[PDB]
Structure formats: C-alpha cells, structure tokens
Amino acid sequence: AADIVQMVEDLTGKLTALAWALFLLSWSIGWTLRGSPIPSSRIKRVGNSLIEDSMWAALWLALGTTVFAVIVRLAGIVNEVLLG
Amino acid sequence: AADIVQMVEDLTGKLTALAWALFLLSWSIGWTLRGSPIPSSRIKRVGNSLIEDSMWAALWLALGTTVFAVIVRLAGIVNEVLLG
Amino acid sequence: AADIVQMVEDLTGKLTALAWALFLLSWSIGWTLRGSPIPSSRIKRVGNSLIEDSMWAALWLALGTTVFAVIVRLAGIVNEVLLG
Numbered sequence: 001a002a003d004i005v006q007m008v009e010d011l012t013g014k015l016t017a018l019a020w021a022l023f024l025l026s027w028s029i030g031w032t033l034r035g036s037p038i039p040s041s042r043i044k045r046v047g048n049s050l051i052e053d054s055m056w057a058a059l060w061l062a063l064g065t066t067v068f069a070v071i072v073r074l075a076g077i078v079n080e081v082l083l084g
Numbered sequence: 085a086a087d088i089v090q091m092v093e094d095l096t097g098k099l100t101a102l103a104w105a106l107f108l109l110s111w112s113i114g115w116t117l118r119g120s121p122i123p124s125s126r127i128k129r130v131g132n133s134l135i136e137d138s139m140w141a142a143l144w145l146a147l148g149t150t151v152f153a154v155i156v157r158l159a160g161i162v163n164e165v166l167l168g
Numbered sequence: 169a170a171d172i173v174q175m176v177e178d179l180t181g182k183l184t185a186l187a188w189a190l191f192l193l194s195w196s197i198g199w200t201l202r203g204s205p206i207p208s209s210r211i212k213r214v215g216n217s218l219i220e221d222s223m224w225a226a227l228w229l230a231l232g233t234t235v236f237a238v239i240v241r242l243a244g245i246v247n248e249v250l251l252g
C-alpha cells in the first residue's frame with residue numbers, strides 16, 4: 001500500500017542522481033567535440049545540440065519537481081471556480 | 085451496502101497516491117533520456133512523449149475529480165430543461 | 169545504485185583530462201597554420217577558427233562544472249517564488 005510508493009520514490013531518487021552525473025558527462029562530451037582539431041561543421045553542430053539539451057534538461061528536472069505542485073494548485077483553482 | 089463504497093474509495097485513494105509517484109518517475113525518466121549523451125532522435129521523441137503524457141495526466145486526474153460533479157450538474161440542467 | 173554513478177564520474181574525469189590535452193593540441197595546430205610560409209587566406213581563417221574555439225571551450229568546461237550548481241540554485245529560487 002505504502003511500501004510500493006516508498007520503493008517508487010527510492011527508484012526516482014537513484015535515477016535523479018544518475019541523471020545529474022549523465023548531464024555533466026554530456027556537457028563534457030559536447031565541449032570536447034567543439035574544441036577538437038577536427039574542422040568539420042556537423043560535429044560542431046552535434047556538440048552544440050548536446051550542450052544545449054544538457055542545460056535544458058538540467059534546468060527542467062527540479063523545475064518539474066515543482067511543476068507537479070503547480071498543476072495541483074491549478075486543479076484546485078479550476079475546481080473552486082467551476083463549483084463555487 | 086456502504087462498506088463496499090468505503091473500500092472502493094480507499095482503493096481509489098491508494099491508487100491516486102501511487103499515480104502521483106509514477107507520474108514524477110515518468111517525468112524524471114523522460115528528462116533523463118532527453119539529456120543523455122546518445123545523439124539518437126527516436127529516444128528524444130520517446131522522452132518528449134513521456135514528459136508530455138505525464139503532465140497531461142497529472143493535470144487531468146484532479147480535474148476529473150471535478151468533472152464528475154460537472155457532469156452531474158449538466159444532467160440536472162438537461163432534466164430541468166426537458167421536463168419544465 | 170551508486171557504483172554506476174561512480175563509474176560515470178570516472179569516465180567524465182578521464183574525458184576531461186583527454187580534453188585538456190586535445191585543446192592544447194588544437195591551439196598548437198592553429199598557431200602553426202597561422203605562421204607557416206603558405207600565403208593563402210583560407211588556411212589563416214581555419215587557424216583562427218581553431219584557436220578561437222580552443223580558447224572558448226577551454227574556458228567553458230570548468231565554467232559548466234559551476235553552471236550546473238548555478239542552475240540548481242535557480243531552480244530552488246523559482247520553486248520558492250511560485251510556492252511561497
């Protein structure tokens with residue numbers, strides 16, 4: 001009943017730690033591709049996409065941890081509006 | 085007679101708690117897939133679908149808790165219209 | 169659970185060492201192309217792009233190591249703002 005929620009939360013915590021590690025790894029890979037001697041352009045594009053997505057997701061993770069409470073508040077507001 | 089309704093409501097409550105936990109887990113999985121070093125596109129698509137469905141359902145759950153009262157009100161209105 | 173994070177961090181460390189080495193190599197290649205007897209202009213342009221990207225990435229690597237903590241702080245601030 002509740003142990004299932006507890007184990008789901010533990011899984012989410014471990015996944016979040018791994019996600020921070022992987023985000024840093026992706027940032028490093030992107031900025032390493034961008035500075036290498038290879039003068040290609042496709043690889044610069046790949047590095048840019050990597051670092052940009054890394055920053056984006058790293059921001060949005062904790063923001064989503066907040067987003068769900070925000071959505072609950074919006075549900076409360078619309079319920080109070082429609083039903084007095 | 086009434087204990088059956090009570091146990092159904094308890095089941096719904098436990099399920100709702102588990103559902104919030106799983107929604108947060110899905111959000112984390114999606115945003116982890118989106119920021120990983122893998123430069124594939126299918127996986128970015130999967131992550132986008134995950135996070136979008138997560139937000140959608142997280143909104144619609146409590147909204148539905150309201151939706152059923154809204155539907156009852158609509159039934160009352162149409163009954164009052166058709167039968168004076 | 170945690171050994172996976174540890175090995176990801178070790179991979180990032182090795183990659184960072186290699187990245188510093190490659191940045192120095194790219195700087196050397198660029199400044200060697202720029203001073204060679206060849207009077208072409210396209211090659212001067214290539215050397216300029218190489219040395220500029222090298223300096224840029226060499227700066228941004230450690231800065232990003234800080235950027236992720238900065239983003240976490242911004243997430244904390246916006247969470248505190250939206251939810252009292």
Ligand SMILES: CC(C)CCC[C@@H](C)CCC[C@H](C)CCC[C@@H](C)CCC[C@@H](C)CCOC[C@@H](COP(=O)(O)O)OC[C@@H](C)CCC[C@H](C)CCC[C@H](C)CCC[C@@H](C)CCCC(C)C
Nearest residue numbers: 001002004007008009011094095096098099100102106109
């Ligand atoms: C990769 C990812 C998929 C996994 C990651 C995370 C993993 C690590 C966790 C694994 C999660 C697992 C697969 C799903 C959870 C199990 C569900 C069925 C819980 C239902 C809620 C549950 C707490 C209710 C408690 O039962 C009431 C008990 C009293 O117990 P108590 O008083 O505490 O002693 O009543 C006794 C019996 C005799 C009552 C019989 C009624 C019967 C049980 C009704 C069925 C309930 C419902 C119809 C099931 C539907 C749930 C699914 C739609 C959700 C599945 C999500 C899935 C995609 C992961």
Ligand SMILES: CC(C)CCC[C@@H](C)CCC[C@H](C)CCC[C@@H](C)CCC[C@@H](C)CCOC[C@@H](COP(=O)(O)O)OC[C@@H](C)CCC[C@H](C)CCC[C@H](C)CCC[C@@H](C)CCCC(C)C
Nearest residue numbers: 011014015018113116117120121122169170172175176179
């Ligand atoms: C090039 C680059 C791609 C690589 C560079 C770096 C490389 C060198 C590292 C390689 C990284 C590898 C490929 C991905 C990591 C593995 C993931 C699945 C970890 C999930 C998190 C994990 C710690 C949780 C721990 O499990 C809980 C255990 C208890 O264990 P314990 O208590 O410690 O004994 O529960 C027992 C079972 C029976 C529970 C069953 C539930 C089941 C496990 C749920 C699935 C979990 C989740 C849905 C997986 C989704 C994760 C992916 C979206 C992320 C992949 C990123 C990828 C692009 C690299």
Ligand SMILES: CC(C)CCC[C@@H](C)CCC[C@H](C)CCC[C@H](C)CCC[C@@H](C)CO[C@@H](COCC[C@H](C)CCC[C@@H](C)CCC[C@@H](C)CCC[C@@H](C)CCCC(C)C)COP(=O)(O)O
Nearest residue numbers: 037038039040041042043197201204206210211212214215
């Ligand atoms: C697609 C990638 C995955 C390819 C990856 C390949 C890589 C893994 C292979 C490892 C290193 C390779 C040996 C690189 C070979 C580079 C060739 C000269 C091909 C040039 C590419 C074509 C399309 C040109 O398109 C780009 C223009 O630059 C010109 C490149 C410098 C301007 C040359 C340098 C100019 C002269 C001085 C070179 C001297 C010749 C030999 C003595 C040097 C060794 C030759 C050689 C053994 C090593 C090459 C070391 C590189 C870093 C200089 C932009 O083109 P664009 O932006 O698209 O418009």
Ligand SMILES: CC(C)CCC[C@@H](C)CCC[C@H](C)CCC[C@H](C)CCC[C@@H](C)CO[C@@H](COCC[C@H](C)CCC[C@@H](C)CCC[C@@H](C)CCC[C@@H](C)CCCC(C)C)COP(=O)(O)O
Nearest residue numbers: 029033036038042043046047120121122123124125126127
């Ligand atoms: C479908 C997925 C489930 C596949 C998952 C596989 C994954 C679980 C396996 C783990 C890691 C793999 C070893 C990834 C291997 C990547 C190959 C180079 C295949 C490229 C994919 C094909 C279709 C290209 O399509 C995409 C273009 O990017 C180019 C990728 C970079 C631009 C390369 C990097 C370029 C050069 C510098 C690489 C240097 C070679 C070795 C020294 C590095 C190690 C090689 C290697 C051991 C690890 C690869 C680390 C990745 C993150 C860089 C877009 O293609 P598209 O968007 O579709 O148009």
Ligand SMILES: CC(C)CCC[C@@H](C)CCC[C@H](C)CCC[C@H](C)CCC[C@@H](C)CO[C@@H](COCC[C@H](C)CCC[C@@H](C)CCC[C@@H](C)CCC[C@@H](C)CCCC(C)C)COP(=O)(O)O
Nearest residue numbers: 060063066067070071074132135136137139140143246250
């Ligand atoms: C499915 C719907 C029913 C979902 C409805 C949810 C809704 C009822 C909830 C109410 C408001 C929510 C709090 C929205 C949260 C938005 C998240 C950032 C998720 C982004 C969605 C993912 C898939 C991205 O996919 C789309 C790309 O845009 C990026 C969005 C802007 C570009 C961000 C804005 C960028 C930065 C500056 C935001 C700053 C962060 C906080 C300080 C702001 C508050 C955060 C927050 C509390 C409110 C969000 C206010 C929105 C209107 C900006 C296209 O993706 P696609 O077109 O598919 O390829």
Ligand SMILES: CC(C)CCC[C@@H](C)CCC[C@H](C)CCC[C@H](C)CCC[C@@H](C)CO[C@@H](COCC[C@H](C)CCC[C@@H](C)CCC[C@@H](C)CCC[C@@H](C)CCCC(C)C)COP(=O)(O)O
Nearest residue numbers: 039201202203204205206207208209210211212213214215
């Ligand atoms: C695109 C590159 C990858 C090409 C790389 C080629 C390279 C790997 C080949 C190795 C060395 C070559 C033998 C270079 C040959 C240079 C030719 C004279 C072509 C001139 C280029 C055209 C477009 C002119 O455009 C540029 C103007 O300068 C004029 C060059 C000096 C001003 C000449 C020197 C003038 C007189 C005194 C030369 C005497 C002739 C022979 C006795 C000398 C040996 C000839 C020869 C065997 C070696 C050349 C040694 C170079 C470093 C001087 C700017 O033009 P721009 O800036 O664009 O407006």
